[PDB]
């Protein structure tokens, strides 16, 4: 077993290192394909904030559990069951959406199956390759450039953009002139991953000028 933590202070992180070492669990700073557990700081109702580790843990169908799993196991002197500490929701998408459990149980039906995604333009706080990894874990293929979409019958194309990261450059309004795919904000990906439900595009579409 291999874990990351998210939202912990240095002191909480060092306690988890001791816990993981005791129980023969690897602890890493960054998530990997071999990660089995993501330990999120939560409130006492198992609601967390959305970090990259949260998204990637769900996208991988991993155990996304509250830090209380660690502290309560210590208190009770017994390794407790992850399913009793599973994160129930987050402050953006809702307190009890159960996305983590849904993803853990739904990897035979991935939310972005049959989609080809171009993560286009600049992004803040989450490099392009990490957003690409996220969508690929959820079944999408990725292309680098708008001209690289397949435009076939076995996949559907989508352009994903973060308009605020473009600052004074309005070019994100001109993608439709270059490309036939729908253009949505990064929140379409993030909301769909957190909920482990592919959202409709309607509320995420970026207006395109002719």
């Amino acid at each position: 077993m291999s874990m990351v933590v998210s939202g912990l202070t240095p002191e909480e992180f060092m306690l988890v290192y001791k816990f993981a070492r005791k129980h023969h669990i690897t602890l890493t700073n960054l998530i990997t394909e071999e990660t089995t557990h993501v330990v999120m700081k939560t409130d006492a109702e198992f609601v967390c904030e959305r970090t990259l580790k949260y998204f990637l843990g769900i996208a991988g169908g991993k155990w996304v559990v509250s830090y209380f799993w660690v502290t309560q196991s210590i208190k009770e002197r017994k390794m407790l069951n992850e399913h009793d500490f599973e994160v129930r929701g987050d402050v953006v998408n809702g307190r009890n959406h159960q996305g983590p459990k849904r993803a853990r149980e739904s990897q035979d039906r991935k939310i972005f199956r049959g989609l080809e995604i171009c993560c286009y333009g600049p992004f803040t706080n989450m490099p392009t390759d990490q957003l690409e990894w996220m969508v690929q874990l959820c079944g999408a293929s990725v292309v680098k450039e708008l001209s690289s979409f397949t435009l076939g019958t076995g996949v559907h194309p989508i352009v994903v953009v973060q308009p605020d990261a473009w600052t004074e450059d309005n070019g994100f309004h001109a993608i439709g002139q270059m490309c036939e795919a729908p253009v949505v904000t990064r929140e379409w990906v993030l909301d769909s991953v957190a909920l482990y439900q592919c959202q409709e595009l309607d509320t995420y579409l970026i207006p395109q000028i002719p």
Partner: peptide
């Protein structure tokens, strides 16, 4: 104080 990890707000 939390961590340095970015959060993704609504």
């Amino acid at each position: 104080p939390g961590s340095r990890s970015p959060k993704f707000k609504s």
